[PDB]
Structures are given as C-alpha cells and as structure tokens.
Amino acid sequence: IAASADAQLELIGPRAAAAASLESAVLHVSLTARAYALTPEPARMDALQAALRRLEGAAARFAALPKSPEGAALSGRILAAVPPFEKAAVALGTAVATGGDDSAIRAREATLPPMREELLSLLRTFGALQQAHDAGASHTILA
Amino acid sequence: IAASADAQLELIGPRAAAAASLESAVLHVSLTARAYALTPEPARMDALQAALRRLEGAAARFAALPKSPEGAALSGRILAAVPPFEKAAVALGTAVATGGDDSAIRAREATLPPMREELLSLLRTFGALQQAHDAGASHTILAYQ
Ligand SMILES: [Cl-]
Ligand SMILES: [Cl-]
Ligand SMILES: [Cl-]
Ligand SMILES: [Cl-]
Ligand code: NA
Ligand SMILES: [Zn+2]
Ligand SMILES: [Zn+2]
Ligand SMILES: [Zn+2]
Ligand SMILES: [Zn+2]
Ligand SMILES: [Zn+2]
C-alpha cells in the first residue's frame, strides 16, 4: 500500500533515465552514421554497428517501463518509429561499406535527420507529459 | 564530427539521469519522513535514515557533472538547498524518535513540503533549460557543413 505507492514513485528515476538513454542512442547513431559517411574506415564502420546495437538496447529498456496513460500513447509512437530509423541507418552504412556513389551515400544519409528530429521531438514531449503526471501522482501519495 | 563532439553529446544521458535521481531522492526523503511520523516503527526510522544517505549520494552525483551556463545558476541553488532540507528532515525524525508532542511533530512536519516543492521546482526548471541547451548543441553539432 505504502510499499506499492513507493514502488510507483520509484519508477521516476529509471523512467527518466531510459528516456534519456533512448534519446542519446538516437543521437549516437546519427553521429556515428554521419561520421562513417564522412570517412569510410573500419573503426568508423565498427562504431556505427555498435551504435545500432546500443539503440536496440535502449529501445527495449524504454519499452519495458510502465508509463502514464498520456505517456504510453507517445511511447507507442516512439517505438514504432525506431525500426524505420534503424533500417535507414543500416542502409546508409551498407551503401558506404559496399563502395556506393558519393551521391548515393549523400541520399541515404539525408534520410536520417528528419527521422532523428521527429524521434527526439516525441521523446521530449513524452518527458514533459510524464513528468506532469509524476507530479500529480506524487502529490496524491505524499498527501 | 570530431571526438570532442561525442564527448560533449554523451554527457546528455548521465546528466539527465542524475537530475531525475536527485528529484527521486528528494521525494523519497519526503515519503519516508511522512510515513515514519504517521506510524513510528523501527523499519520506518531505518528507511528515513537510508533515504537521507541516498539523497546525499544523489546530490553528489549531480554536483559532479558539468552543466550548461543557464543551468549553473539553478544548479548552485539546488545543491545548497539540500543540507537545509536534510537538516529539517533529521529534526522531524529526531522529534518522532525522542517522543515528541503530537503538536511539535506536526510543526516540524509542516516545514518539509515547502522546501521539497521549491527544490523540486528548481530541479525541473533546470531540467527544462538543460534540455533546451542540449537540443541546440546537438542540432549544431549535427548541422551540414
Ligand atoms: Cl552521441
Ligand atoms: Cl493522468
Ligand atoms: Cl519516493
Ligand atoms: Cl531543434
Ligand atoms: Na509538486
Ligand atoms: Zn555518442
Ligand atoms: Zn496524467
Ligand atoms: Zn521512494
Ligand atoms: Zn545554452
Ligand atoms: Zn534539430
């Protein structure tokens, strides 16, 4: 009861942490993909690959958190956008790795930033709504 | 697209985490203090005690990370708010423990929530500003040259 309330409130820190880590994974993927387009070395290709695994890991962690009703709606949208984003970043990396046109690399890569922006904008809104519901639930328990 | 830019951007996650975690430690000290005062019992004194050590650790993690210039203002004040809030929390505890008068304990208790809400308000403002700053730095870092 008190224990179950406290269990609810203690999700805050981890929920916020998972959201930011998904945020940061989306960034790191964009950053590593851009850098590999820029300089098609082994270490760069490897860093991109590692970034995509980090992204799948962050999406999964994020997916597992209980969310507020508002929060869960956005969450679905966020998670549904992650596979297309990964997919596009994989095509980029592949286009580079296989020696594509400097023009084909440019085109694959140009696809990413609109997806990145959308993904980051949804997570930012998720953070805002969830934190508001956290504040309401917080007050109910401490009252 | 240099290494120095990854290092900058990789601070986002931990900083955000340390902010949420301090937010949570502060709630948790409030929640255990209240529960103790409502129902004085050994495990509840223990938890308030544990919550206090947790808050000192969360403050220390948060104080350790670099912050944007906007944050640095709010930041300084957040951290200075912690000791007074802990000190009040100890005084509520100690009052319940030493066998306080139902009135005096209500007074010490009442002195907590204002301090909690102010600190949490600051923290959330800090989060919003740092987020806006991180979003602008990320954008710039990934801009086409
Ligand atoms: Cl990054
Ligand atoms: Cl709600
Ligand atoms: Cl709590
Ligand atoms: Cl922006
Ligand atoms: Na509040
Ligand atoms: Zn990175
Ligand atoms: Zn709500
Ligand atoms: Zn708690
Ligand atoms: Zn700034
Ligand atoms: Zn942007």
Author numbering:
A (entry chain A): 37 to 179
B (entry chain B): 37 to 181
What is the paper's account of this structure, in its own sentences?
Binding of a small molecule or other stimulus to these domains initiates a response in the cytoplasmic domains, which in turn triggers the downstream regulatory processes. Although sensor domains have been studied for many years, there are still many unknowns about the actual ligands that stimulate a given response and the mechanism of signal transduction.
Periplasmic sensor domain (residues 33–184) of chemotaxis protein Adeh_2942 was isolated, purified, and crystallized as described in the methods section. Adeh_2942 crystallized in space group C2 and diffracted X-rays to 2 Å resolution. The four helices are formed by residues 38–75 (α1), 77–101 (α2), 104–134 (α3), and 137–179 (α4). The helices α1 and α4 have a kink at residues Glu46 and Ala146, respectively. In case of Adeh_2942 sensor, the crystallization process selected a head-to-tail dimer; in contrast the well-studied sensor domains of chemotaxis proteins, aspartate receptor, Tar, serine receptor, Tsr, and the nitrate sensing histidine kinase, NarX form head-to-head dimers that are considered physiologically relevant, and the ligand in each case is bound between the two monomers. The four-helix bundle structure of the monomer observed in Adeh_2942 is similar to that of Tar and Tsr sensor domains. Comparison of the monomer structure of Adeh_2942 sensor domain with that of Tar and Tsr has revealed a minor deviation from helical secondary structure in helix-4 (residues Ala146 and Thr147) in approximately similar location, however, the two prolines present in Adeh_2942 (residues 149 and 150) are within the helical secondary structure.
